[PDB]
């Protein structure tokens, strides 16, 4: 499926700053290749993808009352659509 591959959008000062530049930041399945992300985003949003950049974030160690543990490892994809392509909303 395509909606298994794209988990959720990423809303931050950084992600929101590059929306105008037609770059959409998604949290994607940790197993998903940037090729799978390209074709998933095209299926879901009906856009035309120019490039996908991807980066792995390792889990962040957190403490809560003498119990310590790691947040989830994330895979973040930045999807640049074409000039002619329609925008994604958020």
């Amino acid at each position: 499926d395509a909606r298994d591959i794209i988990k959720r959008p990423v809303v931050t000062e950084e992600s929101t700053s590059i929306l105008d530049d037609k770059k959409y930041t998604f949290e994607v399945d940790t197993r998903a290749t940037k090729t799978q992300v390209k074709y998933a985003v095209e299926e879901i949003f009906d856009v035309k993808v120019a490039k996908v950049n991807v980066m792995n974030y390792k889990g962040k160690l957190k403490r809560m009352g003498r119990y310590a543990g790691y947040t989830n490892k994330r895979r973040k994809a930045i999807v640049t659509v074409t000039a002619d392509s329609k925008e994604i909303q958020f």
């Binding site: 499926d1 909606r3 794209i6 988990k7 959720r8 959008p9 990423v10 809303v11 879901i44 958020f90």
Partner: peptide
Amino acid sequence: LKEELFNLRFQLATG
């Protein structure tokens, strides 16, 4: 339902 679930998760993310 999968399309719906995706939209929910998307709206949840954007608050």
